[PDB]
């Protein structure tokens, strides 16, 4: 009855998954041993609960990572598949030679996991787009599972490479090669980039030393809020599919933007009484979203907002109307009433009000534009290309991937500029 498996991949995807599982355990009142104090968890002998997630990676370091952190004993060893080498920041080493011999096995651990459910609402993936392991394996797996279960939807909670603050030197190749395939067999590519996460955690919470734990926790909160209106009753309920129907007008404009609310520090926490219009002003601000792309620089094709807690639905709908009507320029004309709302009934742990905003908006083609810029700059000289062409990859697939990327961005531009 509308269950969700949680496939992971790569080190970043694995850390995000561990954080998300422990946050969900916090919301659903579970302890790090799996005892109470069906959509996500599964029942197990002795009243125990085990998450319905698989954990794949080539390097066994992330194994000890998800063991060390709390709530690591919730998972089951049958879902700990792990290689030995680690693609070491090489895309093809997780898509053709070394990654392949794992995906097969992973298929097994999916096929004796999906059929475990009875009415599966779809999958969801958590991985990176630059790291070879995560990107490559997740792309191959998206391929296989879309070949297997085409009827269900597969959200991809992807973290695109940090555009300007790069930590590796082979991001563009991996990102382009992966997006070329993700645009085909994916349905909800919600992009995240550490630039925006540091921006938020600096200029909205004044925190001292932001480690990856805090960014993972924030993305966890957003991930939970995305489907909590499904997990719980509400005055106006939604799901993983109503979002898709109300968010994409064409089978390939499905790349989203994520935003969470509210977020303040103790100083600002003392002030600013909590009320729905303040939440709207916080969610529809530019820099308050998980993507380093000022949304004013594009138009919102469409945008949904899920509220959590108790409120007055008239206030919600009236604020939505006021905000889509006053700033008519930043919104798109040829589609009317392009905003969407939904309301749950159980807010998070001690948070009287919570908003999760998901928006399909043509203001995110700039990210792909600049990533493809870096790519085509590093490809005209065939730089760092032997590492790939030595592993069966040719040099035509790169041109195909870049041309598909440019076709996607051209689609965004073309059907943004359209009129009625």
């Amino acid at each position: 009855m509308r269950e969700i498996v949680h496939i992971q991949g790569g080190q970043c995807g694995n850390q995000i998954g561990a954080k998300f599982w422990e946050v969900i355990s916090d919301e659903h009142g579970i302890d790090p041993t799996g005892t109470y104090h069906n959509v996500y968890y599964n029942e197990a002998t002795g009243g125990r609960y085990v998450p319905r997630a698989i954990l794949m990676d080539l390097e066994p370091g992330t194994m000890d990572s998800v063991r060390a952190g709390p709530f690591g004993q919730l998972f089951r060893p049958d879902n700990f598949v792990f290689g030995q080498t680690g693609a070491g920041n090489n895309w093809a080493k997780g898509h053709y030679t070394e990654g392949a011999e794992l995906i097969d096995s992973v298929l097994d651990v999916v096929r004796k996991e999906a059929e475990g459910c009875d009415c599966l609402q779809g999958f969801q993936i958590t991985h990176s787009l630059g790291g070879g392991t995560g990107s490559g394996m997740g792309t191959l797996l998206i391929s296989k599972v879309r070949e297997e279960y085409p009827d269900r939807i597969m959200e991809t909670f992807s973290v695109v490479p940090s555009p300007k603050v790069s930590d590796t030197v082979v991001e563009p190749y991996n990102a382009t090669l992966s997006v070329h395939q993700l645009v085909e067999n994916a349905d909800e590519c919600m992009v995240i980039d550490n630039e925006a996460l540091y921006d938020i955690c600096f200029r909205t919470l004044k925190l001292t030393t932001p480690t990856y734990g805090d960014l993972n926790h924030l993305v966890s909160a957003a991930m939970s809020g995305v489907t909590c209106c499904l997990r719980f009753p509400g005055q106006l309920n939604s799901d993983l599919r109503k979002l898709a129907v109300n968010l994409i007008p064409f089978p390939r404009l499905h790349f989203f933007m994520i935003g969470f609310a509210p977020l303040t520090s103790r100083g600002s926490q003392q002030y600013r009484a909590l009320t729905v219009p303040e939440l709207t002003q916080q969610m529809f601000d530019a820099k308050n979203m998980m993507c380093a792309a000022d949304p004013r620089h594009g138009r919102y094709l469409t945008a949904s907002a899920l509220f959590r807690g108790r409120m007055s639905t008239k206030e919600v709908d009236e604020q939505m109307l006021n905000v889509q009507n006053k700033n008519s320029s930043y919104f798109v004309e040829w589609i009317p009433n392009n905003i969407k709302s939904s309301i749950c009934d159980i807010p998070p742990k001690g948070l009287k009000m919570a908003v999760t905003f998901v928006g399909n908006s043509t203001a995110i083609q700039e990210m792909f534009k600049r990533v493809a810029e870096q790519f085509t700059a590093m490809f005209r000289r065939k730089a760092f290309l032997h590492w790939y062409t030595g592993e069966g990859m040719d040099e035509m697939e790169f041109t195909e991937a870049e041309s598909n990327m440019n076709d996607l961005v051209s689609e965004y531009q073309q059907y943004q500029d359209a009129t009625a």
Binding site: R266, Q270, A273, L274, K349, G350, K352, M353
Partner: protein
């Protein structure tokens, strides 16, 4: 018979006014219960706001 008809209509009108005053009793009780409602909800709102903000 004229006197009897006059008396009966007088009693009927008295019953009318009596039911009207009953309904007014009910309306005033309604208004005051609504004010009780709004003040209690305001205090509950302050309580939930303290609970959410002191949540460090």
């Amino acid at each position: 018979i004229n006197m009897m008809r006059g008396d009966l209509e007088d009693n009927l009108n008295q019953k009318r006014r009596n039911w009207e005053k009953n309904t007014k009793e009910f309306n005033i009780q309604q208004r005051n219960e609504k004010l009780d409602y709004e003040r209690s909800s305001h205090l509950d709102n302050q309580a939930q706001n303290q609970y959410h903000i002191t949540y460090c």
